[PDB]
């Protein structure tokens, strides 16, 4: 199984070949022909009366390639919802242009006995490989005095009168899910370091790595000749720092910043490096 070490204290002897592991499968470069720039939302129901199969109720895509016959007019993100049972057409509705502002709330025009169960609002990003989901509980009651809604500490719990409409809230306004976005820049990795006992925001740049293969090194020649990252880092998502040879002056805090702003990816691997001998 895969694990993520986000911060660690490591000791290397002076003169050794130190390796500071920085890796991520989401920082792997792929060709444009494989990019599936598509966001999908779908509501699923794990019914309590059925108690077995969890069926999909309705989904909505963000992007598509408009055609007229065999002529490909182009691709532009628009949007359209699709119910999976022809009977729910007109009964289950999502907000129009849901991906414009991140409002994916499910509207049920008139709840039925078979609508009872645990709902899930699921977001899929095929380009950024993101999966987000929230749960909503729905109970159908015949007593209107019991109809209402409350937050039980983790999810919305609905109690709807039979035949009455319901709204299952699902809102995610993060830029990766909405149509708004800054122009996508290539993936970039930043290595920096600071002496022991110094806050992170006062670190000195050590090395920049861009997905196109371009790199930028900092520091005096004595430091640059001992610090490197193996070639084709973005081909395998490995940006591990190589310090060879490691010196007692290299003792300090090292940071590996992984950036893919278009996908909301901003992670940091921290290394408190100690040098013995």
Interacting residue ranges for Cl ion, rule: CB under 5 A: 112-113, 233-234
Beta bridge mates, 161: 141
Give whichever of 214 and 247 is closer to Cl ion, judged by the CB atom.
Answer: 214
Specify the residue for token string 């319901």.
166
Indicate the pairing of strand 18-20 with strand 71-83: unpaired
Distance (Å, whole) CA 38 – CA 182: 17
**From the CB of 22, what's the least distance to Cl ion, in Å?**
13
Give whichever of 26 and 175 is closer to Cl ion, judged by the CB atom.
Answer: 26
**From the CB of 119, what's the least distance to Cl ion, in Å?**
17
Give whichever of 191 and 234 is closer to Cl ion, judged by the CB atom.
Answer: 234
Distance (Å, whole) CA 140 – CA 64: 37
**From the CB of 232, what's the least distance to Cl ion, in Å?**
5
Give whichever of 234 and 271 is closer to Cl ion, judged by the CB atom.
Answer: 234
Specify the residue for token string 């901003």.
266
Minimal CA–CA distance to 122: which of 170, 157, 81?
A: 170
Give whichever of 113 and 154 is closer to Cl ion, judged by the CB atom.
Answer: 113
**From the CB of 35, what's the least distance to Cl ion, in Å?**
19
What's 115-174 look like in SS3?
HCEEEEEEEEECCCCEEEEEEEEEEEECCHHHCEEEECCCCEEEEEECCCCEEECCECCC
**From the CB of 114, what's the least distance to Cl ion, in Å?**
7
**From the CB of 9, what's the least distance to Cl ion, in Å?**
28
Contact 199, 181 (CB under 8 A): no
Give whichever of 104 and 234 is closer to Cl ion, judged by the CB atom.
Answer: 234
Instruction: For the beta carbon of residue 268, count every other beta carbon within 10 angstroms.
Output: 15
């Amino acid at each position: 199984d895969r694990s993520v070490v986000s911060e660690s204290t490591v000791s290397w002897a002076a003169g050794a070949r130190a390796v500071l592991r920085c890796q991520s499968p989401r920082m792997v470069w792929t060709q444009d022909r494989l990019h599936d720039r598509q966001r999908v939302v779908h509501w699923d129901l794990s019914g309590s009366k059925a108690g077995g199969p969890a069926r999909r109720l309705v989904d909505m895509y963000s992007t598509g390639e408009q055609r007229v016959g065999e002529q490909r007019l182009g691709e532009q993100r628009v949007g359209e919802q699709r119910v999976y049972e022809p009977r729910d057409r007109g009964r289950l509705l999502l907000p129009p242009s849901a991906f414009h502002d991140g409002n994916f709330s499910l509207f049920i025009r008139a709840v039925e006995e078979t609508d009872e169960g645990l709902y899930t609002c699921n977001l899929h990003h095929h380009y950024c490989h993101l999966y987000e989901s929230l749960a909503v509980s729905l109970e159908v009651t015949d007593d209107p005095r019991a109809a209402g809604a409350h937050w039980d500490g983790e999810k919305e719990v609905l109690a709807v009168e039979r035949g009455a409409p319901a709204l299952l809230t699902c809102v995610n306004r993060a830029h990766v899910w909405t149509d708004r976005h800054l122009e996508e820049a290539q993936q970039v990795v930043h290595w920096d370091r600071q002496p022991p006992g110094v806050p992170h925001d006062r670190a000195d740049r050590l090395l920049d790595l861009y997905a196109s293969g371009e790199r930028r090194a900092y520091g005096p020649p004595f430091l640059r000749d001992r610090v490197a990252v193996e070639a084709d880092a973005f081909a395998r998502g490995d940006f591990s720092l190589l310090i060879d040879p490691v010196e007692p002056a290299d003792e300090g805090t090292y940071s590996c910043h992984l950036h893919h702003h278009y996908c909301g990816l901003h992670e940091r691997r921290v290394f408190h490096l100690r040098v013995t001998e």
